Amino acid sequence: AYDMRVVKFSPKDHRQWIYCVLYVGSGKGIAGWGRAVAPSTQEAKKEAI
Amino acid sequence: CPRCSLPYSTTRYCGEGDVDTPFRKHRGRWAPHQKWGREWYDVVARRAE
Amino acid sequence: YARGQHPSYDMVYAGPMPEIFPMRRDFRKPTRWDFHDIEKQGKYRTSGPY
Amino acid sequence: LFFLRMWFLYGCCLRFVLFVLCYYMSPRLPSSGNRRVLYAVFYLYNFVWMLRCFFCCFIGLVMSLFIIEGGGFVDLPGVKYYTRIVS
Amino acid sequence: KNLNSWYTKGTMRGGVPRIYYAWMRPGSFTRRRFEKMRNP
Amino acid sequence: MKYADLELTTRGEFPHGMKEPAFVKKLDQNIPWYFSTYRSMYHWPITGDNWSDLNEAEKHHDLHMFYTLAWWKLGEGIFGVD
Amino acid sequence: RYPFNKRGPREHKSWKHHVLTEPPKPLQWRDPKVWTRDLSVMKSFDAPQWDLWQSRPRSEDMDEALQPFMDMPKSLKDRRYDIPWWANPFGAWYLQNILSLELLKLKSKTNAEKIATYRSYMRSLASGKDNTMSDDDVIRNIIKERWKTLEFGDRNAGYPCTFGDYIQFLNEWFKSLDEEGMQRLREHFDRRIRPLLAVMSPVDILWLEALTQNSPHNKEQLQRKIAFQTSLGTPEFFDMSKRLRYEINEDYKVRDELGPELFALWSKAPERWPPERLSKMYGLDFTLVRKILVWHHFKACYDACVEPDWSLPKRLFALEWIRDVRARKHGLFYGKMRFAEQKITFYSDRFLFRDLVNRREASYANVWEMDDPYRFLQTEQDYEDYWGDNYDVYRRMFPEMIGRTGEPVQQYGQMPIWAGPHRQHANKSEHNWMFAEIGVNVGHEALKKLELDPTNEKRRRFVIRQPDGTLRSAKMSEMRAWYWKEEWADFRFWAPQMEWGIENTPSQEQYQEHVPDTTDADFRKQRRIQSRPVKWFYESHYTRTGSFAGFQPLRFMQRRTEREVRWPDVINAAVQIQKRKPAAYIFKAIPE
Amino acid sequence: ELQRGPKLTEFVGHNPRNGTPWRFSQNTKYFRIGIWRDTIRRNDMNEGLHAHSSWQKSPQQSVPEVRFLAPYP
Amino acid sequence: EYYRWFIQPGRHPNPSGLTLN
Amino acid sequence: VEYLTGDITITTVMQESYDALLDTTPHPHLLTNGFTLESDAAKYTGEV
RNA sequence: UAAUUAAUAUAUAUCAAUAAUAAAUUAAAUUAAUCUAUUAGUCAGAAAUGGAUGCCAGCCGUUGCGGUAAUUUCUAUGCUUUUAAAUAU
Ligand SMILES: [Mg+2]
Ligand SMILES: [Mg+2]
Ligand SMILES: [Mg+2]
Ligand SMILES: [Mg+2]
Ligand SMILES: [Mg+2]
Ligand SMILES: [Mg+2]
Ligand SMILES: [Mg+2]
Ligand SMILES: [Zn+2]
C-alpha cells in the first residue's frame, strides 16, 4: 500500500509525506516486511525496503 | 494403418466405420491415418515384448 | 525374537532413501503460457497454461 | 446491518403501495438539492399504514401503485424505502 | 488409518514456485567443520 | 552414409531457452490475480510401472538431447584439461 | 439500488456487430507460396524451432534424429546417396583431426628439457615448476582446441564443412546408435552439457552462438548489452569454461573410485563380503558410503561385461526400503518419503537401552550369521514388504495372495407349484430377477466378509431368477453389488492409477470448456500423440494395483468456496477459472 | 555429495510430486511488463510477478538442478 | 514443412496471402 | 534353460527366416545383401 | 380373479418439488417428442472517450460525487468481466 500523511514542520509550513507498506520475499524460505514515512514516493519505497 | 489396422486405400481416418474404436470419441475429432516407419515398427515390437 | 532378546531393526533406524541413479534431464515441456507472440495467449483463447 | 429500517416490509423483500402525495425535502448538508419523496399507503391485517419513501423511479403516463424495496442509506435522513417500478 | 494422502496435499498457486527439501535443510548439509576439525 | 551435399541457409537461433521476449506496454487482461489464482488438474508422474508402447520418456529425452548436442557441437571445445 | 428503475436492460450493441466481420475474408486467390500445399492454413514465417516434432503427431518425424531432416520431403531424401562415412566432408575432418593420432606432430624436446622433465617425474622436490605438463594433457589440449577452431561455412572458401554437412553426418550417426551406444552418449551429455545447462546466463548467449558461428537477430544490441554487463566482473568470472572448476569433498575423487576397491576379492565370493568389510574403507557417513558401494558394484560389473545385481541397492538400503514401503502404505502416495512427513514423537534420552544391551550381548555361530543380508526380517509382513517387487520371489513365496478359488454358482431347487401348468408360465419372464436379503443380521459393511463367508450358516442369502424360470445363487460380483462401493488401492509397490489427473478427467471438469478428444496432439495435455491400446492388456497384471478417489479435486470443486478477492468485482473462487466469452458468436462453416 | 552438491528443488503445482520442476519462462503474459521494467531500470528494485519467472536479473538463472551448495559459483 | 529452413525470419513475403492479379 | 533342456529348439524355418532378414536389412559397418546401388551416387563416389 | 401389456394425469391447485440439465464449432448406437431463451458494470476496484448539465438535475453497498473542463449525474458510442443476473429481504 501507498498512502498520504500531512507532516507539519511549523504553523505555516506543511509537507505531504507518503507512506509505504511492503514485503520482500523469496519462496526459498526467507521473507521480511517494512513500512516507512518519507517525503516522496520513491523515497518511501526505498526506505520501506 | 499401424494404429487402427484399417486399409489405406479405402479409408481416410483412424477408426472409421469401426463400432468399438478408441480413436474416435463423441465430440472429438477425426485423426488421419498414421504411416509405417521406425516408430510404429518398434511399437509393435514393444507390444510383442 | 520370541523372547524379546533379538536386536531390533525398526523403521526408526532408516535414514534417507538416496537417489542412486539420477533419472534423466527433464526438458522444458512447452505450455500454453510459453509463446513468442503475446497474441497466442489471448484472453479470448488461452485461460491458463494448461 | 440495520434491522429497524425495514419495519414496514414486515419480513418481505418487496411491497406494493398506492400513491397519495408527492412532496419535496432537502437533504442533510453538505448535499443541496430537492429530494422527491412519495407518500404512499398500503394495508395489512385490515390496518391502513402510511408509508413514506424515496422516489427514484420513472413516471410515464399516470399510474397508481408502486413496488417498494429497502436500500442502504440516502442523502435524506428519515426515508428508508425506495421505489422499484411504478405500475 | 490416515485417509489424508500425502500424495495430494497442497494448493496450486499457479505460477508461484516454492522450494522443498529432499531430506534435511541445506544448511545442515555439509558438516565439514567437525569433519576436518576446524572448531575452537 | 546417405549423404547429399545440401545447402541449409537458415537455422533458427540457439535453443538456450533464454531470449529477451517481445515487449508490450498495455496487456489484454489487466488482472494479475489470475496468475496466482489459477489451478489445474493433477500431474501424476506414474501409473503402474509406467509402461507404454510408444516409449515416451526415452524417445523424447533422446530427441531433445540430439539437437542439444548438435548446437553445442558435442560440448567438445569448451572444456580444457583441469 | 435497483438498476432497472427508469430504464430497461440495455440492448445497446448487443450483437456488437463491429466484431462479427473484418470486411476482408479470403478467396480462390490465396498465394501458394505463403499458404499450405492444401491452402488449408497460413504458413508461419518466424524462425524455425528445432523441437517442433513434440507438438505435432506426424510419424515421418521419428524416422530421423535432427529436425531439418524430419521436415525434408521424400523427393529430396531420395537424392541422398549412401557413401562411406568419411566421404562426408565433416567425417573427413573428424578423421584427419581427431581420430588420426599418427599425423599429429609434437614439438620435440631438447636434451636439457628431456633431463629436467625426467628428474622432475621420478623424484619430486618442492618449489619446482608446477607445470611439468604430461604430453597426454598437452595432446588432449591440442585436440580440444581443434574443436575450438572448427568453424563451418562455404568450403570453397576456407573452412572444411557446410553446416548442413555437419548435421547431416550427425543425423546419420544418431540413427546409427545401439543401446550402449546411446547410453555412452547420454552419459557424455550428463557429464559435460547438463551442468552447463544449469550454469548458463543471458550474458553468454553471444558466446553461446559463437560455437556454431550462427548469426543472432539482435547481434549489435546484444554486443552492447553483454559488453556493458561483462564489464561488471573479471573476465575469468564470466567464461563458461571455468564455472565448474571446484568440487566439495576432495579426499575421495570420482576418478579414483573408477577402479573399484578389492574387486579381485568380492567378485569371487560376494556373500563373504557384506557391505561392512568394504565400508571400513571410507571416512564418510553411512548413506554416502553405501551409495558409493552400489556404484562400485555396478562399475565393476559393466567392466567385466556381465550384468549387475539390481537387487543390490535394495539389499544395502534394506531398512530404507522397508521404511519407504510402509510409509507409502501409511500416507497414501507413491515416491520416497521425505523429512517433513516423519513422525514427531520425542524419545527419551535412554530410549535405546533395551536394544543396546540386546546388541552388546548378542552372539553368533559364524560371521555369516552375524551379517546376513536378511537379519532385518522376522515376521511374514517383513518378507512381504521386502519382496513385493519381484513377482518371481513373491509369486513363489506367497501363493495364497492370488485367489484361485471361489464359491461356485449353483442352481437352487425349485419350490413345487400345485397349480401345475396353469401357472408355470408365471416365473418365466423377460428379465433376470435378483433378490438380496436384508434384516437385522445382514447388510452391515463392518461384517461384510463374515456375511459372504460360505462357512457361516447365517450367511446373507441371494437368489436369481433366470428368464427361463430357473434359480441360481449369486455370482460373487453380484453379491458384492449389494454393499457400498469399496476402493482397493495399495501404494506399496507399483503406483495405483489416480483419479482427477490430466489424461483421466474428462473435459468439462478439467477445463470449463469443451475440448475435443482427438487421439493426436493435445496441446493442452502436453502430449504429442497417442496409440490407444486396451488399458490392462499389454501391461503385467501385478502392476495393476487400484484406483484412488479419496481426495478433493481442487481445480474442479473445493470446500468452503469464497471469493479470493472482493474488489475488483471480477475475481471469484479459485474453482471458476475460465476464458472470456466473446461478444455474440460467429459460426464459420466447417467442412473446409 | 562428493561433487558439486545437491540440486535446488522447486515445484509449480500442488505438491512436489504433482507439479513440474520448471518455472514459467519469459514469454508469459504477466512477466513481460515486469521483465521490461527490469531491463530498463536495472539497478532499482522492481515490483511484479516477473520474479517467479525462470529468467531474472542475476547471472544465475532459475532452472532445474541448479547446484546451489557448490563452491563455484 | 521444409520451407522453414530457407526463409529470412523478418520477411513475410506476402502477409495478405492474396495473389490477386 | 528351455534350450538346454531340449524343450525349445531352433528349427529350419526360424533359421532361414532369421537369415532372410539378416540379409535384407542395413548392417552398421558393412553393405548388405539387399542394398540397392544408386546410379547417381557417382556425383560423390566417382563411379557409377 | 373387475383389472394388471400397468406406472399417461388435462389442465388444475395447494403451499411446495432445488430445471439457464453439454448457455455455445464436428451431431445425437432414439422412440425425434418440450423448447427458440435475455439483463450487469464502466470513481475507488477489470473497464473510457465525445456531448450535454452546472450544488441543478441526479447518483448513493460505502468514503462520498455535482461550483463550466464531472474518469462518480444524464445520453451516445466503444470497452470490461472467472460465463445459472442484477437487485431487494
Ligand atoms: Mg425485521
Ligand atoms: Mg450516503
Ligand atoms: Mg526389548
Ligand atoms: Mg482501474
Ligand atoms: Mg448509476
Ligand atoms: Mg456546458
Ligand atoms: Mg464524462
Ligand atoms: Zn489408422
HSE (side-chain half, CA atoms, 13 Å) at G118:
7
Q: What is the dihedral of CA D60, D63, D67, D71, to 10 degrees?
A: 50
Produce one character per residue of H18-44: b if its CB has 16 or more CB atoms within 10 Å, e if not: bbbbbbbbbbbbbbbbbbbebeeeeee
CB G496 within 8 A of CB G548: yes
How many CB atoms are closer than 10 A to CB B3? 23
User: Nearest nt to G19, CA vs C1'?
Assistant: K78
Instruction: Report the Cα–Cα distance between both ends of chain H, in Å, rounded.
Output: 17
Which residues in window 45-64 of D are less than 7 A from strand K by Cβ? 56
Q: Are C43 and F28 in contact (CB under 8 A)?
A: yes
**Residues within 8 A of B (CB atoms), F 49-68 only:** 53-55
The candidate with the shortest Cα–Cα distance to G527, out of G514, G539, G515, G537, is G515
CA of D33 from ligand 6 middle (Å) equals 20
CA distance G592 to G38: 11
CA distance G420 to G410: 25
Please report the resolution in angstroms: 3.3
Extract the C-alpha cell encoding G37.
500445399
CA distance linking residue G32 with residue G6, whole number of Å = 59
Chain centroid to CA G362: how far? 45
**Distance of alpha carbon D71 from alpha carbon D5, whole angstroms:** 9
Contact yes or no for H29 and F28 at CB 8 A: yes
Look at strands A14-26 and A30-38 and give their pairing. Answer: antiparallel
Measured CA to CA, the distance from residue D22 to residue D66 in angstroms comes to 13
User: What is the Cα–Cα distance from G484 to G477, expressed in whole angstroms?
Assistant: 13
Cβ pairs bridging G and I (under 8 Å): 45
Helix axis angle, G179-191 relative to F56-71, nearest 10°? 60
Q: Rounded to the nearest 10 degrees, how much is the dihedral formed by the CA atoms of G565, G569, G575, G579? A: -130
Pick F38's closest partner by Cβ from G163, G528, G577.
Answer: G577
Instruction: Indicate yes or no: CB of I20 within 8 angstroms of CB of G29.
Output: yes
Nucleotides of K under 7 A from a protein CB: 22-29, 38-41, 45-47, 55-66, 75-83, 85-89
**Ligand 6 centroid distance, CA of F52 (Å):** 75
Nearest alpha-carbon partner for G77 in E12, F1, I10: F1
Helix residue spans in chain I (DSSP H) = none
* Residue among D84, D70, D51, D66 at smallest CA distance from D6: D70
- Cell numbers standing for residue J1: 534353460
G252, H63: Cβ pair inside 8 Å? no
Q: Which of F73, C37, F70 is nearest to G51 (CA)?
A: F70
Question: Which contacts of H36-39 are long-range, i.e. CB under 8 A and separated by 24 or more positions?
Answer: H36/F23, H39/F20
CA distance A42 to A40: 6
Angle D12-D18-D20 (CA atoms, 0-180°, nearest 5)?
135
- List, in order, residues 6 or more apart from G407 with CB less than 8 Å away: G454, G473, G476
Is residue G529 within 8 A of residue B23, CB to CB? The reply is no
Coil, helix or strand for G181? helix
D2-5 own/partner pairs: CB under 8 Å, 24+ apart: D5/D70, D5/D80
d(CA A33, CA A44): 13
How many Å apart are CA C39 and CA G370, to the nearest integer? 70
The span from the CA of G31 to the CA of G334, in Å, is: 55
Phi, psi of D53 (to 5 degrees): -140, 160
- Binding residues of B, as ranges, are 1, 4, 14, 33
Q: Is the CB of G37 under 7 A from strand K?
A: no
Q: How far apart are CA G313 and CA D83, in angstroms?
A: 81
A30: helix, strand or coil:
strand
Nearest in space to G252 (alpha carbons), one of C20, H3, H67, H7: H3
Q: Specify the experimental method.
A: cryo-EM
**CB neighbour class for D5 (10 Å; exposed up to 12, middle 13-18, buried from 19):** middle
Interface of G with D in 35-54 (CB under 8 A): none
Q: Strands E18-19 and D81-86: what pairing?
A: unpaired
Which residues make up the environment of ion ligand 3, defined by Cβ < 5 Å? C 4; G 354
| CA atom of G573 to C1′ atom of K25, Å | 29
Q: Which amino acid, D50?
A: M
Numbers of helices and strands, H then E, in chain F: 2, 0
CB contact at 8 A, D85 and G4: yes
D74/K74 CA-to-C1' distance in Å: 20
On the CB side of G61, CA atoms within 13 Å amount to: 18
Write out the H or E segment, with its range, that includes residue D68: strand D65-70
Q: Is J2 helix (H, G, I), strand (E, B) or coil?
A: helix
User: According to the 3-state scheme, what is the secondary structure of G133-167?
Assistant: CCHHHHHHHHHHHHHHCCCECCCCCCCCECHHHHH
CA of G35 to C1' of K80 (A): 36
- Which uninterrupted H or E stretch holds A15? strand A14-26
Q: Which residue has the cell 525496503?
A: A49
Around B38, how many Cα atoms within 13 Å sit in the side-chain half-sphere?
10
Beta G497-498 vs G547-548: how paired, if at all?
Answer: parallel
Instruction: Give the Cα-Cα-Cα angle G409, G410, G412 (nearest 5 degrees).
Output: 140
* G12 CA, K50 C1': Å apart: 17
